[PDB]
Design a protein around this ligand. Structure first.
Ligand SMILES: OC[C@@]1(O)OC[C@@H](O)[C@@H](O)[C@@H]1O
Ligand SMILES: OC[C@@]1(O)OC[C@@H](O)[C@@H](O)[C@@H]1O
Ligand SMILES: OC[C@@]1(O)OC[C@@H](O)[C@@H](O)[C@@H]1O
Ligand SMILES: OC[C@@]1(O)OC[C@@H](O)[C@@H](O)[C@@H]1O
Ligand SMILES: OC[C@@]1(O)OC[C@@H](O)[C@@H](O)[C@@H]1O
Ligand SMILES: OC[C@@]1(O)OC[C@@H](O)[C@@H](O)[C@@H]1O
Lengths: 90, 90, 90
């Protein structure tokens, strides 16, 4: 009966990304040090998790969006979201 | 029908914080290397997520507490919890 | 009505671990840079969260598995999963 969130952060400013699953859709709010704003992530899902890592100064984000028993991985690597290779079996 | 948790950690000892949403309330358990104990975080919420980052040796924690469609951000920056600026729109 | 996931990552390749709670059981999918595969974690739980940290190059993972109001901590420290000391009270 409530939305479900997932959060990641990087750097020292820092950058924060908060993903919210709400009525089957996942959206993204962003902080880069001076105000929250809406990010470019908008994908179907009833459940979300997230992890991220740096390579040097370059951020890489992985968002795991689940509907039913199907989890779709979404990838940010500095220049657009792409579908990742994650599968739950095989 | 089960509680919902979120976890973060920092350092090498390490420090761990585990947040549990239970019957609309979020509480905090803490590990600083030698035993679990109850933390000072106690706020309403049906869902919780968390992220944290270091600036030097200084930890900063952000806990996202959601009830219905409203997410409240709680901030630890070394000396007490404060409400953060996060909003889901505007 | 959907599975619930939790994700962690470490290093630069990176390593990713994704935990899925599905019908009361938590399983693990792994990425070490070249293909997803099934990990050795398989434990009861309706809800999962995870955190991890490095000591030097050595990864340490903590998975928090909850059923009802009982959260069990599972520990990876390079050579097998063990039950952790976490308790929600006392
Ligand atoms: O500056 C915001 C942004 O570009 O940051 C990286 C990702 O979080 C994107 O979805 C997002 O739109
Ligand atoms: O470059 C994207 C990718 O290779 O990154 C590592 C993992 O997240 C993979 O599933 C994903 O396809
Ligand atoms: O030592 C425990 C503590 O001070 O650590 C930082 C935050 O997790 C606080 O809520 C918590 O009470
Ligand atoms: O100092 C607190 C604060 O500015 O930290 C960064 C973000 O978490 C903000 O929403 C929050 O208000
Ligand atoms: O290489 C996979 C593996 O050994 O990595 C560390 C842990 O995630 C284990 O459960 C997992 O089987
Ligand atoms: O070595 C395992 C252990 O001591 O690691 C730190 C915490 O996760 C504890 O609950 C856990 O028992």
């Amino acid at each position: 009966s409530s939305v479900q969130t997932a959060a990641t952060s990087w750097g020292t400013v820092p950058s924060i990304r908060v993903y919210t699953a709400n009525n089957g859709k996942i959206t993204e709010r962003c902080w880069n040090g001076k105000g929250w704003y809406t990010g470019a992530f908008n994908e179907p899902g009833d459940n979300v998790s997230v992890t991220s890592w740096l390579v040097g100064s370059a951020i890489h984000i992985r968002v795991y969006a689940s509907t039913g028993t199907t989890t779709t991985e979404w990838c940010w690597d500095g220049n657009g979201w792409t579908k990742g290779a994650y599968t739950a079996t095989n």
